[PDB]
Amino acid sequence: ELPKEMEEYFEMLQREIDKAYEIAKKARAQGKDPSLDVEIPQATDMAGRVESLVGPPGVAKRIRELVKEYGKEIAALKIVDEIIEGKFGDLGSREKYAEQAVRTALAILTEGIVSAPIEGIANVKIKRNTWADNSEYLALYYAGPIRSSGGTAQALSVLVGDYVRRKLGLDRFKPSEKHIERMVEEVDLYHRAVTRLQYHPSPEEVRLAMRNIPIEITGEATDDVEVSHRDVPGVETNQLRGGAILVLAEGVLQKAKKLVKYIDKMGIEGWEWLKEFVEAKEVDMGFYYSLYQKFKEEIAPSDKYAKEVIGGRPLFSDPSKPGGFRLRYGRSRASGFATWGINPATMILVDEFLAIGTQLKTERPGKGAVVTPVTTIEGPIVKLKDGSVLRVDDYNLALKVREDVEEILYLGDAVIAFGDFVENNQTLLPANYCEEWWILEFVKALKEIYEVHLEPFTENEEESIEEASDYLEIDPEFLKEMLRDPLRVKPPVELAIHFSEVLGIPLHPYYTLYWNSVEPKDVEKLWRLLKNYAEIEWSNFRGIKFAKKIVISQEKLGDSKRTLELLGLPHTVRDGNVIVDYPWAAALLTPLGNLNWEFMAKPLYATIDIINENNEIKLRDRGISWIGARMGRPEKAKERKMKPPVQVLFPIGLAGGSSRDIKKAAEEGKVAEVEIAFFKCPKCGHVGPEHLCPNCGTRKELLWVCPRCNAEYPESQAEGYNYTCPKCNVKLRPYAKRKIRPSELLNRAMENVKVYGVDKLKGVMGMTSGWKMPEPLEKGLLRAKNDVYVFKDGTIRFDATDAPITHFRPREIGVSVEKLRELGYTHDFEGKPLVSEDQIVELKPQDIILSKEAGRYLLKVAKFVDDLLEKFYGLPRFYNAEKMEDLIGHLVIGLAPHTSAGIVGRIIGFVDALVGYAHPYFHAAKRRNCDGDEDAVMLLLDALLNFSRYYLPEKRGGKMDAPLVITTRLDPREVDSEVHNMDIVRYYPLEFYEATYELKSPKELVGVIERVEDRLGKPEMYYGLKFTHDTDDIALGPKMSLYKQLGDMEEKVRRQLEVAKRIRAVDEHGVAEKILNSHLIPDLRGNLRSFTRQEFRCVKCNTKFRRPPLNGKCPVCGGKIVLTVSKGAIEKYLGTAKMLVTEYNVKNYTRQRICLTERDIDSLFENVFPETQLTLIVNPNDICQRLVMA
DNA sequence: CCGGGCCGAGCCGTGCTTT
DNA sequence: TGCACGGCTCGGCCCGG
Ligand SMILES: [Mg+2]
Ligand SMILES: [Zn+2]
Ligand SMILES: [Zn+2]
Ligand SMILES: [Zn+2]
């Protein structure tokens, strides 16, 4: 099976997990906790997760064998059949069987990670068609959490319900027309008043869907809005069913393609209507002129990403505008899942709005990505204040020259993986000329002419190197260097021209200017001026002449200076002369044949076409495909704290005040009345909210109370009574409203842990669970002492943005080679022994690289855990850390905010960025996509000691974010489906570049380029992956977004508009400000309409009155009444809006809207705030009065 | 010396909508 | 995508009559 390294890796991981689990089990046995054992079982594959989460017991082996035999979908269907026939045990009525089968099937088809089977499916019930035939059918009730599951999960739930209804021998749902009207109205109102829904079903589609769904999709109410078609038969509510309508909109409708694919694979009949719906939904010119025409015909610009711009979030490029982001096909070391590659220079030169991990909304491949530094690609070309043009391909140069920038001519490159085009099914765009194409042409031409076999990006035999160098008359060392790293070693321009002359290949892409960005008439005028009024110095190299310098005066150059800037030619202006220096004089004069032939404009021809037709040295289009993007959602790395911060899960009520301070209530002697669980000692008879009796140190028993007669029974007594009151007749409850004196409890806790010096200790107003079991106060004291905070289930968590990585360097993460060899790494990614810190090593699937904020916080968490173990439990310390670098080799838990299972990872290094780097398999095993998502990490021992299932809220969305099970091993076969499209090749073949020019589809050449899916099953899914582009440093560049250092809204808008003004391909003046105004106008108009219909509230109480009390004071107390929508909330964005209107070009519609909004704001308060104040000076150059008087 | 003026934390509420 | 903005109270310190 697996080789002798992956097995050792997984064995060591299991050994460490066992080492932690032993201590966690030993500590929990002493009885100071809700349970006497750990409450997080460990799974290993999908069957274990499904068995632990939904059951029924014993299903694991059956799932295993069925998956081995048939597959995934077929195995799910056979499991459903076996459950229905009753192999795993008798359950009860048909409803129980239906619920169990649907839950297990939805868990199997999902791989048992996301909590849709546990949370979304609230209930399954059988209903009768009393309106038509009195026949039976099946219905599904969807709760609130189903909106977080995803379209695939929702659609698969619908399909599983259909299959179970078919196999139960039940009839079809037959809706009345009023049902259709009610559902259409529900969808429309939900979109209008709640959310955008990210999908708009047309009413015809909704009617068709209702007419052709064999099950009833309903549920409880999730929004406080009534409907019109009330009292519909079979419906027990008259409010919005958000879960059901969201399922219907974003499931079967938004993801019909995947649903019909699943139906075809699954062999399910009766869904032909969906298949039909899906199939209905589905002269002498120049080469480059025709290519541009076909590009514009087939692939069309998209504006969806730029339909809205928030104040403070800049737009970096208009849709498919030349001068924006240059598209490059490839995958870097730390990109590929859904992220982009960006040079740090263009991160700096946009006022540092972009930072490592900052999300942005893209146009072509998908929608959204995360930026990552790649120093191997090109940067911006900028125009300075004195008129010079520079190529800022370097980070330090960008820092140096930042203040002199006048305009950004070109914005730089963006590396996008080929697997991102396959996943989103996007037509391939023609590829800009690059070094990774030139090197392939070079080696192919060398082989064709001289019959020498060489290969880029690797090491070749010495005989071939010597033969090629003898033929080409070059240094063999330089040939080896260039073939090894074509992206960093470039020949001098004269050598490039000599290569083009001899071998017959286009010019090196580094020395090609953007010729096709100008018209041939501009080049005609420029050629005339160069021939007439220029002084050029020539040179020689192997009989090849080339220019060395051009000096032409500014007046003689005239208005053709703009042409030199559009070609991206670096020059300088001195004492009236424009000077073009050595490397960039031949880059301009060689294509034009050194003025030997006359450039002449032609119709239906492009500049490169004319150059190729007339010249001997040939060229390729260097910029033809451009991309647009827009900023959104800056990067994040911060701890998790509840809406009011909490340090212990202990209810205090109103005694503690506004901050729920337990210590303040204790020090004032207050007595609080709250609902808690009381425990009673069997031997002596102590009573109170504690798990151990202080008198004797023995475990107590929970007390059960009668809701009607308040009779208390111990757990042993209530066990026989079947948890029902014999004297009364009501089901018991474990909690009742009781009285507590905080002083005694706090003093006992302080004496217990010897922690007396704590200032504040926050609790909760009321426990949300059904048991209302409280937490020990000693844990709260230690958390307060060590400055950490608690979560809803008792764990301490840290939230960060996720980014991918496959290969690392021992110096980027600050780890010595000896430590790495101790961890288990012994070779670099090419087979050589690991001896240096500059070699590239490959990352094992479950190794993570934390940030430094995360390390700083986890140091406090580890200190708290050590204090807990030493003081509360009386056991030796575990971590023993004094610096963040002492946590290396310790295990964490990763958890997405919508799943119920975790995955174990290992710490190996730290970076100085606000992102969480990890393997692509690690992020996919949490059902995450890596284009803006944020997840959590917690120490394994902390979760083991602290997590409990008795602190979980009792509503439906209470089991989300909880590690009910953890996975110990990684299986790439059952992680996700988007990560199966990634690339594992060192370089793209020549066929890919040649096929991009034909505008093919990525499905045609899916076999040419190796992907992850091509390796599934075989042992080398963990073994060898590769990348295309290298990086000097993985965390180089700005680290914090500038958006987080601006306070006012006006300042944000001004900075964003300056940024938009600098960039050439944005066109701020009329679209940026207008689309921005369509973000402040909703705020203004929507706050004036809520001032005239608002509810009032009391300062002391929380009582809300829908109309003001007519005595002016709170009827139930003595406090005063305050508004909920103040007067200053309406007109907070009025000044910025007026500035935007008066400064920039907006259509008269928006200007009139703003003027009338101001007039309406000043007219509603006409007789409550009269203008009794005169003034000295008036007319501050306003715009409203000017518009009125004009 | 004893009484105010003032800051700095905290905790609440709110973000287009034809008849 | 949700966060970003306004307003009310309540002590802890100066600083002055
Ligand atoms: Mg995502
Ligand atoms: Zn006792
Ligand atoms: Zn009773
Ligand atoms: Zn009141």
GROMACS .gro file of N, CA and C (backbone and C1' of nucleotides) in nm, chain A residues 192 658 660 1082-1083 1087 1090 1104 1125 1153, chain B residues 9-18:
model
  100
  192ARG      N    1  -3.727   4.040  -0.130
  192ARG     CA    2  -3.748   4.184  -0.119
  192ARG      C    3  -3.705   4.237   0.017
  658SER      N    4  -2.469   4.542   3.406
  658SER     CA    5  -2.467   4.537   3.260
  658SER      C    6  -2.362   4.442   3.206
  660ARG      N    7  -2.246   4.170   3.354
  660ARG     CA    8  -2.260   4.036   3.410
  660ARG      C    9  -2.137   3.996   3.491
 1082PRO      N   10  -2.901   5.422  -0.053
 1082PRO     CA   11  -2.985   5.329   0.025
 1082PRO      C   12  -2.981   5.355   0.174
 1083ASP      N   13  -2.865   5.390   0.229
 1083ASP     CA   14  -2.856   5.419   0.372
 1083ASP      C   15  -2.941   5.540   0.408
 1087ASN      N   16  -3.312   5.502   0.624
 1087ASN     CA   17  -3.309   5.547   0.766
 1087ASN      C   18  -3.414   5.656   0.789
 1090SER      N   19  -3.750   5.467   0.841
 1090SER     CA   20  -3.758   5.396   0.970
 1090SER      C   21  -3.767   5.498   1.084
 1104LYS      N   22  -3.973   4.745   2.493
 1104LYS     CA   23  -3.989   4.821   2.370
 1104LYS      C   24  -4.135   4.855   2.349
 1125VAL      N   25  -3.396   5.485   1.650
 1125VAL     CA   26  -3.335   5.544   1.531
 1125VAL      C   27  -3.320   5.693   1.560
 1153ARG      N   28  -3.173   6.341  -0.695
 1153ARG     CA   29  -3.210   6.258  -0.582
 1153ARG      C   30  -3.143   6.307  -0.454
 1199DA       P   31  -0.977   5.346   2.662
 1199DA     O5'   32  -1.072   5.220   2.690
 1199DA     C5'   33  -1.211   5.240   2.708
 1199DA     C4'   34  -1.263   5.158   2.824
 1199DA     C3'   35  -1.335   5.031   2.785
 1199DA     O3'   36  -1.333   4.939   2.892
 1199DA     C1'   37  -1.491   5.195   2.860
 1200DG       P   38  -1.341   4.781   2.862
 1200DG     O5'   39  -1.491   4.742   2.901
 1200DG     C5'   40  -1.586   4.715   2.799
 1200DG     C4'   41  -1.722   4.771   2.835
 1200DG     C3'   42  -1.839   4.713   2.757
 1200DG     O3'   43  -1.895   4.604   2.829
 1200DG     C1'   44  -1.859   4.951   2.793
 1201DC       P   45  -1.956   4.478   2.750
 1201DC     O5'   46  -2.107   4.522   2.720
 1201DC     C5'   47  -2.195   4.552   2.827
 1201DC     C4'   48  -2.307   4.643   2.781
 1201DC     C3'   49  -2.390   4.587   2.666
 1201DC     O3'   50  -2.506   4.523   2.718
 1201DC     C1'   51  -2.343   4.824   2.642
 1202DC       P   52  -2.591   4.422   2.626
 1202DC     O5'   53  -2.712   4.512   2.573
 1202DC     C5'   54  -2.695   4.592   2.457
 1202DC     C4'   55  -2.811   4.688   2.437
 1202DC     C3'   56  -2.877   4.680   2.299
 1202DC     O3'   57  -3.003   4.615   2.310
 1202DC     C1'   58  -2.783   4.897   2.334
 1203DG       P   59  -3.092   4.589   2.179
 1203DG     O5'   60  -3.133   4.736   2.130
 1203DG     C5'   61  -3.226   4.752   2.024
 1203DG     C4'   62  -3.199   4.880   1.947
 1203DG     C3'   63  -3.192   4.864   1.796
 1203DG     O3'   64  -3.320   4.883   1.740
 1203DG     C1'   65  -3.008   4.996   1.877
 1204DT       P   66  -3.343   4.824   1.595
 1204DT     O5'   67  -3.267   4.905   1.481
 1204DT     C5'   68  -3.312   5.035   1.444
 1204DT     C4'   69  -3.218   5.097   1.343
 1204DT     C3'   70  -3.205   5.021   1.212
 1204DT     O3'   71  -3.303   5.069   1.119
 1204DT     C1'   72  -2.988   5.082   1.296
 1205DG       P   73  -3.331   4.990   0.982
 1205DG     O5'   74  -3.231   5.057   0.877
 1205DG     C5'   75  -3.229   5.012   0.742
 1205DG     C4'   76  -3.113   5.076   0.666
 1205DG     C3'   77  -3.045   4.984   0.565
 1205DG     O3'   78  -3.087   5.018   0.433
 1205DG     C1'   79  -2.890   5.051   0.732
 1206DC       P   80  -3.201   4.932   0.359
 1206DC     C5'   81  -3.365   5.017   0.174
 1206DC     O5'   82  -3.234   5.018   0.229
 1206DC     C4'   83  -3.397   5.150   0.109
 1206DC     C3'   84  -3.528   5.156   0.032
 1206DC     O3'   85  -3.582   5.287   0.037
 1206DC     C1'   86  -3.350   5.196  -0.115
 1207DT       P   87  -3.733   5.310   0.087
 1207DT     O5'   88  -3.820   5.221  -0.013
 1207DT     C5'   89  -3.813   5.243  -0.153
 1207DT     C4'   90  -3.911   5.154  -0.226
 1207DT     C3'   91  -4.043   5.132  -0.154
 1207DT     O3'   92  -4.145   5.099  -0.247
 1207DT     C1'   93  -3.920   4.930  -0.155
 1208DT       P   94  -4.297   5.139  -0.218
 1208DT     O5'   95  -4.355   5.178  -0.361
 1208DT     C5'   96  -4.495   5.191  -0.381
 1208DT     C4'   97  -4.525   5.268  -0.508
 1208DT     C3'   98  -4.654   5.228  -0.577
 1208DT     O3'   99  -4.703   5.337  -0.655
 1208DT     C1'  100  -4.468   5.159  -0.707
   0.00000   0.00000   0.00000
